[PDB]
Design a protein around this motif. Structure first.
Motif, PDB file in Angstrom:
ATOM      1  N   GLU A 168       0.831  -1.210   0.000  1.00  0.00           N
ATOM      2  CA  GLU A 168       0.000   0.000   0.000  1.00  0.00           C
ATOM      3  C   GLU A 168       0.874   1.272   0.000  1.00  0.00           C
ATOM      4  O   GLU A 168       0.628   2.208   0.763  1.00  0.00           O
ATOM      5  CB  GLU A 168      -1.041  -0.029   1.160  1.00  0.00           C
ATOM      6  N   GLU A 197      -1.557  -2.398   8.066  1.00  0.00           N
ATOM      7  CA  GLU A 197      -0.396  -1.844   8.762  1.00  0.00           C
ATOM      8  C   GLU A 197       0.523  -2.943   9.295  1.00  0.00           C
ATOM      9  O   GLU A 197       0.045  -4.011   9.692  1.00  0.00           O
ATOM     10  CB  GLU A 197      -0.791  -0.837   9.869  1.00  0.00           C
ATOM     11  N   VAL A 198       1.834  -2.656   9.316  1.00  0.00           N
ATOM     12  CA  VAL A 198       2.884  -3.569   9.807  1.00  0.00           C
ATOM     13  C   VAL A 198       2.679  -3.914  11.272  1.00  0.00           C
ATOM     14  O   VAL A 198       2.407  -3.034  12.095  1.00  0.00           O
ATOM     15  CB  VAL A 198       4.320  -3.016   9.646  1.00  0.00           C
ATOM     16  N   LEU A 200       8.069  -1.737   3.735  1.00  0.00           N
ATOM     17  CA  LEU A 200       8.105  -2.491   4.995  1.00  0.00           C
ATOM     18  C   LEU A 200       9.520  -2.918   5.363  1.00  0.00           C
ATOM     19  O   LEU A 200       9.950  -2.787   6.523  1.00  0.00           O
ATOM     20  CB  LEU A 200       7.209  -3.735   4.838  1.00  0.00           C
ATOM     21  N   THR A 247      -6.369  -3.738   8.406  1.00  0.00           N
ATOM     22  CA  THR A 247      -5.899  -2.350   8.274  1.00  0.00           C
ATOM     23  C   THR A 247      -4.773  -2.184   7.253  1.00  0.00           C
ATOM     24  O   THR A 247      -4.611  -1.100   6.694  1.00  0.00           O
ATOM     25  CB  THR A 247      -5.433  -1.817   9.634  1.00  0.00           C
ATOM     26  N   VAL A 259       1.729  -8.296   8.607  1.00  0.00           N
ATOM     27  CA  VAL A 259       0.853  -7.150   8.342  1.00  0.00           C
ATOM     28  C   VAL A 259      -0.555  -7.485   8.805  1.00  0.00           C
ATOM     29  O   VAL A 259      -1.013  -8.610   8.598  1.00  0.00           O
ATOM     30  CB  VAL A 259       0.933  -6.802   6.814  1.00  0.00           C
ATOM     31  N   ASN A 260      -1.245  -6.513   9.447  1.00  0.00           N
ATOM     32  CA  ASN A 260      -2.621  -6.694   9.893  1.00  0.00           C
ATOM     33  C   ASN A 260      -3.484  -6.882   8.651  1.00  0.00           C
ATOM     34  O   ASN A 260      -3.438  -6.061   7.731  1.00  0.00           O
ATOM     35  CB  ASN A 260      -3.091  -5.508  10.741  1.00  0.00           C
ATOM     36  N   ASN A 310       3.843   1.660   1.133  1.00  0.00           N
ATOM     37  CA  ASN A 310       4.709   1.743   2.311  1.00  0.00           C
ATOM     38  C   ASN A 310       5.768   0.673   2.217  1.00  0.00           C
ATOM     39  O   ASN A 310       5.430  -0.505   2.143  1.00  0.00           O
ATOM     40  CB  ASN A 310       3.921   1.571   3.617  1.00  0.00           C
TER      41      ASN A 310
END
Length: 164
Positions: A33, A60-61, A37, A58, A54-55, A35
């Motif tokens: 997305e 997110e890491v 990582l 959401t 990653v969630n 980003n």
């Protein structure tokens, strides 16, 4: 075009772009997305298997870690794999060598995340995988007759859309 991917992702999907390392000199890269990582410039990559959690909702890491499959111990890798909860997106990329210290238990644990290539992973083969507790899995075998590098295969790359 998130992560610099060729085709755009639909709704309730995370765009991802990943690459294995090049020989023992350029680290792997994992983007999701738009980003980054894991990468060399981020300085959070190392020899062996590099893993990003990653969630699944959401995007997110949760965590990033790498485990030396040449000179390190497989036991912390096996412990870390046993901590992964259901729903978590797991992205794995090799750097240099990801197979010498692998055990049948470590391979079985990765296979449960949706991996078909982990069982057969060998010395210096490049491999990228995006699974979860498949598909999205790509590999290039270490082969002296075909290898781009002197002892290592070319970088393996993969991009796609993970459902939310």
């Amino acid at each position: 075009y998130k992560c610099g991917i060729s085709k755009a992702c639909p709704e309730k999907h995370f765009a991802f772009k990943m690459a294995s390392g090049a020989a023992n000199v350029v680290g792997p890269k994992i983007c999701l997305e738009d980003n980054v990582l894991m990468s060399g410039v981020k300085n959070n990559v190392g020899r062996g298997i590099n893993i990003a959690l990653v969630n699944g909702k959401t995007g997110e890491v949760i965590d990033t870690k790498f485990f030396d499959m040449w000179g390190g111990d497989v036991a912390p890798f096996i412990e870390f794999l046993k901590t992964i909860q259901d729903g978590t997106v797991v992205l794995m990329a090799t750097y240099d060598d990801g197979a010498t210290k692998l055990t049948d238990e470590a391979r079985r644990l990765i296979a449960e995340l949706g991996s078909t290539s982990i069982t057969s992973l060998g010395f210096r083969d490049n491999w990228v995988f995006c699974g979860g507790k498949s598909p999205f899995e790509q590999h290039i075998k270490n082969n002296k007759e075909t290898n781009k590098y002197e002892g290592w295969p070319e970088v393996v790359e993969m991009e796609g859309c993970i459902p939310q």
